[PDB]
């Protein structure tokens with residue numbers, strides 16, 4: 001659960017909540033109401049409230065006087081199970097999440113929505129067990145739970161399904177369905193009736209199986225959807241996606257081993273065990289030779305990806321072992337080697353025309369070709385002692401992404417991804433496309449999600465369903481924190497919009 005995040009609270013509201021409703025060890029996180037990508041962890045200690053800044057420019061959550069993390073849920077989990085210190089160096093304990101009652105970031109909460117608007121959506125878009133909660137209109141301050149129940153098999157409105165409305169009273173900021181338990185929030189109420197469904201007198205079980213899906217759109221409707229989300233609506237949609245990251249706390253035990261600690265660019269940004277790339281055929285003398293900070297990303301609903309960090313000096317040999325083993329023939333690099341004077345990826349390829357050995361692997365840089373937004377390096381990768389293992393690996397190095405934030409226009413990213421796509425498609429049986437930035441989650445996640453969405457539209461044309469948050473959530477189940485900021489989220493929509501618009505101009 002992610003109840004400790006309060007989306008619509010000020011700093012002074014946060015202090016007053018912790019001092020009146022919390023104890024020492026209580027904590028909550030909140031966004032800056034202005035500067036986006038700024039968050040604050042507010043913590044009660046010795047009867048007073050401290051505020052700790054968390055910045056995200058696109059690559060990771062950077063907690064002041066703490067560490068860097070892939071998600072705020074992973075940050076909270078780390079500190080609640082271990083470390084966090086103030087400037088004078090004193091320990092700040094995160095013991096007791098201070099829960100938020102605001103329903104605005106729940107997928108099922110649709111706010112103003114009228115009752116006829118709600119029946120039409122559940123009828124057209126909904127399925128058995130699809131539900132939503134909306135404000136009443138007839139009884140102001142109260143709410144309505146609308147639920148669809150029925151036989152999904154039919155392709156006609158033949159009375160085999162129906163919508164039921166359940167009035168939710170709000171009496172003294174507790175919520176109830178007219179009887180029984182009174183809940184501190186709509187979330188507690190929905191969670192209760194999700195496990196213990198209401199039964200009608202004549203037997204119908206009002207099963208709350210899934211929130212109504214309103215984010216799946218026809219690709220042709222993209223421009224209208226961007227217009228609706230710009231009236232922001234992008235913020236609400238993104239924060240609803242972020243609220244689901246508590247469902248993605250999969251184990252990362254391999255990355256936590258002592259033997260593997262120094263193979264991580266950031267100690268707490270780690271690959272999930274279940275999708276990590278396992279390196280085989282290692283040196284028998286190296287005790288733990290199977291680890292790289294990289295995950296297979298397999299779109300689920302033909303191309304797959306490996307999402308990885310920028311190489312460290314001590315992982316370059318591992319990186320080439322990964323590329324060789326997986327039969328990857330295309331690398332996508334989305335950072336400069338150095339940004340803001342700090343190393344984001346070591347140079348792991350030879351100079352133009354040069355040959356280098358990286359342990360058992362040999363790489364030739366055959367030729368570099370410079371475009372406005374990117375450099376292409378044609379590399380030849382082989383295993384030392386086995387000349388018939390040579391294959392070309394095409395390295396696409398995107399060089400113009402801004403140091404902070406996202407490109408103001410998606411055209412360059414789209415032209416780059418189109419080229420990468422055609423390269424990959426031209427090579428029979430090519431393995432996954434390797435995509436890396438610095439930590440391998442922010443830019444890397446953005447490029448991979450764009451590529452996925454654009455691949456649907458390229459094969460099906462403008463009449464295909466896409467669902468941006470659903471696709472992100474699927475990718476975030478395979479590597480932590482894929483797509484870091486609201487700015488990248490909006491950029492994904494803008495890239496899909498631009499891609500559609502240029503397909504209609506052709």
Ligand SMILES: Cc1nc2c(-c3ccc4nn(Cc5cn[nH]c5)cc4c3Cl)c[nH]c2cc1CN1CCNCC1
Nearest residue numbers: 104106107109212214215237240241244469470473474
């Ligand atoms: C309905 C809705 N959905 C979303 C998602 C969204 C979509 C689809 C997802 N599917 N899954 C599971 C999964 C498994 N594999 N892949 C995805 C999670 C998903 C989320 Cl979080 C992100 N923002 C959203 C906003 C809304 C509507 N808002 C109205 C205003 N008040 C807040 C609600």
